[PDB]
Ligand binder design. Structure first.
Ligand SMILES: [K+]
Ligand SMILES: [K+]
Ligand SMILES: [K+]
Ligand SMILES: [Mg+2]
Ligand SMILES: [Mg+2]
Ligand SMILES: [Mg+2]
Ligand SMILES: [Mg+2]
Ligand SMILES: [Mg+2]
Ligand SMILES: [Mg+2]
Ligand SMILES: [Mg+2]
Ligand SMILES: [Mg+2]
Ligand SMILES: [Mg+2]
Ligand SMILES: [Mg+2]
Ligand SMILES: [Mg+2]
Ligand SMILES: [Mg+2]
Ligand SMILES: [Mg+2]
Ligand SMILES: [Mg+2]
Ligand SMILES: [Mg+2]
Ligand SMILES: [Mg+2]
Ligand SMILES: [Mg+2]
Ligand SMILES: [Mg+2]
Ligand SMILES: [Mg+2]
Ligand SMILES: [Mg+2]
Ligand SMILES: [Zn+2]
Ligand SMILES: [Zn+2]
Lengths: 127, 202, 212, 97, 97, 91, 25
RNA sequence: GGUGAAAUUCUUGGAUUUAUUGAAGACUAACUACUGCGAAAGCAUUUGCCAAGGACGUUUUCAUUAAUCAAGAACGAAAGUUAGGGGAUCGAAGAUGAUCAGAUACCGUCGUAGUCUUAACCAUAAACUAUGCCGACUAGGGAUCGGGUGGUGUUUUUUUAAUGACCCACUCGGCACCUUACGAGAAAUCAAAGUCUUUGGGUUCUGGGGGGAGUAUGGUCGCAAGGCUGAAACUUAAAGGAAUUG
RNA sequence: AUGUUU
């Protein structure tokens, strides 16, 4: 009874991507990033920027005809963080509050089987 | 003589006339005298057998591989060299192979190869240790040794000749579009200097 | 200034043949042109749909199903089983401390032509009256359990087609078979077939595909 | 002197333990020494649970959780206050708070 | 195992080592079982098989070469084929196949 | 008695060609002049003819092999790979 | 100075002494 | 993209993101624990083969064959060396962007050797439990691993029962832990670091204030880096350990 | 985030 897309929210640090595509994912509809909605070079990951980007993505989606979205949230993954950035929650808030329906939320963060020796050296980042 | 790899004399029966046909294959490692060699589309996957590239599974190691079907062997013929089957394209039948140089080639699936690696491997690991040994090596191949450096010649003899010190004088990297008499040095070199890092650019 | 969505037309992914429900959703693609056919742009798309959204029963919220479009037939994408996997949240919820995790993987050929890799998972469990707080296995019970699971998976496959294997995965009868064959080794609370992977497809066989 | 009765780690009868990288700074720390915290969070943390239950097309969706084991080095754990400096007697307390 | 039974036959029973004595025993009908080394030439193995078929003698194919067969029969030389004339107090004759 | 401490067969080269080159040559000359077990008759009678040819003085069987050893590790790996692929093809 | 860096400086000094002694004969 | 903030960098040759595949090499997450094995270094995907090992059980066998060990040998993290293969990631060097007063440091982007493997070296680590090995004795307790013993035991079916898992109790061996210490210690603390001026079970190694100095020299080992052995002159009244209060 | 000596 609805037209389903896929939200594919990639919420890293320093940026959050709101990228709605079709069910397969081959075709994308209105991929908007948190950096496109703020000019500070540091607010691109911020919840306000993520909310604005997701509002724009939802507005453009419901002119194409996407009424509901299955939700796939990911962090950077690989070997870097495993933890979603601050903007994923705001992006999901704006997606749910802009009229789009929500379905099948999932965490698709890439998780290795202990591969890819991590960047930073054995003494880590020294701050 | 002049070849590192040993040759195998394989005798077959002539299917159309009563007589024997001796063929000179490049012996693969493990091939022995008195061994039965099977060659054809329906021969088994055994070392020394000659099979079409399409009839072997991915990962098969072949040698004396034909570039075109019926050319009787072009690729991976030197001692210790071999070709790796990496996959087949059954529609418009082609087999992807990796050559000894590391290059990926698409060959007709009807082209044949000998299962195994060419015998005589590890040959270049032994230092020649002697100008005499290099002399006897090239005596049975060709008159390409010894080599006088072009920089040790006079200008009339070579582009590198002349000068009050031995030096090239201009870049030794020579354009591919240069003409005969100019192509001395590093012809059409993409890069120069000591190679550091990984090969197989893509 | 192009608006690429003006030239895109919608299609309906009539994806399964027997799961519970024909309709799974819609997808859009560029309209057919001379040098770029929409039928070519389609027919390779893989869609991941929840087994609960395929069966109508909420007890299938995990075990997503991959379906690859095998044929584009008049706004109807007729697909077939392409693979299944548990959800990350479900898998992490079953993977708990103070218990032994047992994993088994088999590479099998189905009855007709299909090559699959089956990953099954199981976890040791506490008894009703256990005082011990971890309930670990003895690394030979693990080997016996892995052997039993491998035999069970290689017997369930090699005796059924891809569609029959799918229709046996939906009820989770393999989980019950593993439980019955392993209850004499270790409790194994959480037996599951966590993943089915399609390794090599046979010839297209449009006749066999045309079952929906 | 020796600050901790066994060590600042958990390794007796082991000898060597494979290292893990701190999730915060990527410092290599032996796995038995690293501070390990399981983070099991709701995907929608606290505020938009109502909004997502309203926008959901499924009644009683029972939204999932994100599970993530965080491995910290000692310096990063102390800086982020996952662990804290304790009194000499309070250090001899292994029960979680 | 097979090596143990062979050692028991060597120490207690009667046997012949080698191709000529094995063929002589096969043609004399006093061979109960012939054990053929893995690396035995195929023509010789086939002819021994034919003799054993003619004399109704069991054939066991030793998994090792002639060196291994000699070691198993407790000798310091290569043995390509062993012929058992009397098994002695050993179950090599019945516990095969 | 031990006539040479380390040069071994390369004592014929005297002080020439460098110690590293003499060592590298020594390893492969030992390999190429070693006696190997015949895989057909079980005797330690296989010796090199020309490079890549290894003949058993007993049973007169010659096998194509490596330049300085009867079987290179690459050839052993290729034999195992071919056996595995043949087994997969047959079953 | 750190004992490790003292050891490294001493090793460099030993290498320099070995070179200067080898150059003489 | 990256950061605290930036910049180097990539980007209408469409960067980043998304989907279907492919290739390469590395690693073996979660399970993973005050848990296991090994002489130590170390060892974490499955399965197959090969030999090995502790503990347990034993009314099996020998009968002192034993303990510790100069000289002498085997193994020995990482880094490093030689020659091949491989070279995804990270990454000494190097190049760069930013900060700074300077910053060829921390932070950022690349990136060679290396990181991986075969064949040879190297033989060093806060190679740590900073606690030699063997033997006996001197408190209590609960866990846990492996084996064994017993039970009107719970649970699983084969058809009596049996194993499997679990509970209770005991026991041997092990990783450890908690309390108290008769006791020990300078104390921190220690079931050993106790059974020491009431001083002796056996044995090996090492130290004699701090530097100079693990230096010089000699010998020896190594391809090298270096390893092992190792002074003296001279100089100095402290250096150091634990704990207390600020 | 940084701020040099006594
Ligand atoms: K940012
Ligand atoms: K010149
Ligand atoms: K590299
Ligand atoms: Mg940015
Ligand atoms: Mg800090
Ligand atoms: Mg030359
Ligand atoms: Mg010259
Ligand atoms: Mg001249
Ligand atoms: Mg000229
Ligand atoms: Mg010129
Ligand atoms: Mg001149
Ligand atoms: Mg301190
Ligand atoms: Mg250690
Ligand atoms: Mg694992
Ligand atoms: Mg364990
Ligand atoms: Mg000694
Ligand atoms: Mg090492
Ligand atoms: Mg700083
Ligand atoms: Mg030391
Ligand atoms: Mg020490
Ligand atoms: Mg002193
Ligand atoms: Mg002090
Ligand atoms: Mg002062
Ligand atoms: Zn850290
Ligand atoms: Zn022979």
């Amino acid at each position: 009874s609805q037209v389903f897309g896929v939200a594919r929210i990639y919420a890293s640090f320093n940026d959050t991507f709101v990228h709605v595509t079709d069910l397969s994912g081959k075709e994308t509809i209105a991929r908007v990033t948190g950096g496109m909605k703020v000019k500070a070079d540091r607010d691109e990951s911020s919840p306000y920027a993520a909310m604005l980007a997701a509002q724009d993505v939802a507005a453009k989606c419901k002119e194409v005809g996407i009424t509901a979205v299955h939700v796939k949230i990911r962090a950077t993954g690989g070997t870097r963080t495993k933890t979603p950035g601050p903007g994923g929650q705001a992006a999901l808030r704006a997606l749910a509050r802009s009229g789009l329906r929500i379905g099948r939320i999932e965490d698709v963060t890439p998780v290795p089987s202990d591969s890819t020796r991590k960047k930073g050296g054995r003494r880590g980042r020294r701050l | 003589s002049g070849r590192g790899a040993p040759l195998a004399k394989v005798v077959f029966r002539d299917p159309y006339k009563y007589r024997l046909r001796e063929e000179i294959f490049i012996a693969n490692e493990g091939v022995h005298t008195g061994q039965f060699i099977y060659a054809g589309k329906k021969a088994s996957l055994n070392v020394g057998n000659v099979l079409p590239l399409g009839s072997v599974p991915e990962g098969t190691i072949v040698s004396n591989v034909e570039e075109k079907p019926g050319d009787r062997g072009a690729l991976a013929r030197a001692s210790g060299n071999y070709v790796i089957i990496i996959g087949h394209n059954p529609d418009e039948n082609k087999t992807r192979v990796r050559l000894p140089s590391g290059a990926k080639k698409v060959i007709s699936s009807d082209a044949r190869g000998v299962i195994g690696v060419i015998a005589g491997g590890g040959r270049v690991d032994k230092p020649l240790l002697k100008a005499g040994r290099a002399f006897h090596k090239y005596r049975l191949k060709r008159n390409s040794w010894p080599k006088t450096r072009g920089v040790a010649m006079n200008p009339v003899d070579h582009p590198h000749g002349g000068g009050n010190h031995q030096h090239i004088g201009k870049a030794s990297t020579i354009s591919r579009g240069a003409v005969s008499g100019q192509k001395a040095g590093l012809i059409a070199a993409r890069r120069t200097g000591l190679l550091r890092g990984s090969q197989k650019t893509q | 200034v192009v608006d690429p969505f003006t030239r895109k037309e919608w299609f309906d992914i009539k994806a399964p043949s027997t799961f519970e429900n024909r309709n799974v959703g819609k997808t859009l693609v560029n309209k057919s042109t001379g040098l770029k056919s929409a039928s070519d742009a389609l027919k390779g798309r893989v869609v991941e749909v929840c087994l609960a959204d395929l069966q109508g029963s909420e007890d299938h919220s995990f075990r997503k199903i991959k379906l690859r479009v095998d044929e584009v037939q008049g706004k109807n994408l007729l697909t077939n089983f392409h693979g299944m996997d548990f959800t990350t949240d479900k898998l992490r919820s079953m993977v708990r401390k103070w218990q032994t995790l047992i994993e088994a993987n088999v590479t099998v050929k189905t009855s007709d032509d299909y090559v699959l890799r089956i990953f099954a998972i199981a976890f040791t469990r506490k008894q009703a009256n256990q005082v011990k707080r971890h309930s670990y296995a003895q690394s030979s019970h693990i080997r016996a359990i892995r052997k039993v699971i491998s035999e069970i998976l290689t017997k369930e496959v090699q005796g059924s087609t891809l569609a029959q294997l799918t229709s046996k995965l939906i009820p989770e009868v393999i989980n019950k078979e593993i439980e019955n064959a392993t209850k004499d080794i270790f409790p194994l609370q959480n037996i599951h077939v966590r993943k089915v992977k399609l390794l090599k497809q046979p010839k297209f066989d449009v006749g066999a595909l045309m079952a929906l | 002197p020796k600050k901790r009765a066994s060590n600042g780690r958990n390794k007796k009868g082991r000898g060597h333990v494979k290292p893990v990288r701190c999730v915060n700074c990527s410092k290599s720390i032996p796995k038995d020494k690293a501070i390990k915290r399981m983070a099991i969070r709701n995907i929608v943390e606290a505020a938009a649970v109502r909004d997502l239950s309203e926008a959901s097309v499924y009644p009683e969706y029972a939204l999932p959780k994100t599970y993530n084991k965080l491995h910290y080095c000692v310096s990063c754990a102390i800086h982020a206050r996952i662990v804290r400096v304790r009194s000499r007697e309070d250090r001899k307390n292994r029960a979680p708070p | 195992s097979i090596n143990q039974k062979l050692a028991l036959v060597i120490k207690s029973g009667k046997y012949t080592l080698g191709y000529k004595s094995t063929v002589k025993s096969l043609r004399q009908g006093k061979s109960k079982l012939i054990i053929i080394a893995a690396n035995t030439p195929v023509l010789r193995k086939s002819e021994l098989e034919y003799y054993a078929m003619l004399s109704k003698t069991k054939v066991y194919y030793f998994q090792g070469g002639n060196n291994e067969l000699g070691t198993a029969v407790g000798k310091l030389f290569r043995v390509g084929v062993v012929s058992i004339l009397e098994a002695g107090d050993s179950d090599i004759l019945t516990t095969l196949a | 008695a031990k006539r040479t401490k380390k040069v071994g067969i390369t004592g014929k080269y005297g002080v020439r060609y460098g110690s590293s080159l003499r060592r590298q040559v020594k390893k492969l000359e030992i390999q190429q002049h070693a006696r190997y077990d015949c895989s057909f008759c079980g005797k330690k009678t296989v010796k090199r003819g020309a490079a890549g040819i290894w003949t058993c003085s007993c049973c007169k069987k010659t096998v194509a092999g490596g330049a300085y050893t009867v079987s290179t590790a690459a050839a052993a790996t290729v034999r195992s790979t071919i056996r595995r692929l043949r087994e997969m093809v047959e079953a | 100075m750190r004992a490790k860096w003292r050891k490294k400086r001493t090793r460099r000094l030993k290498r320099k002494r070995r070179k200067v002694r080898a150059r003489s004969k």
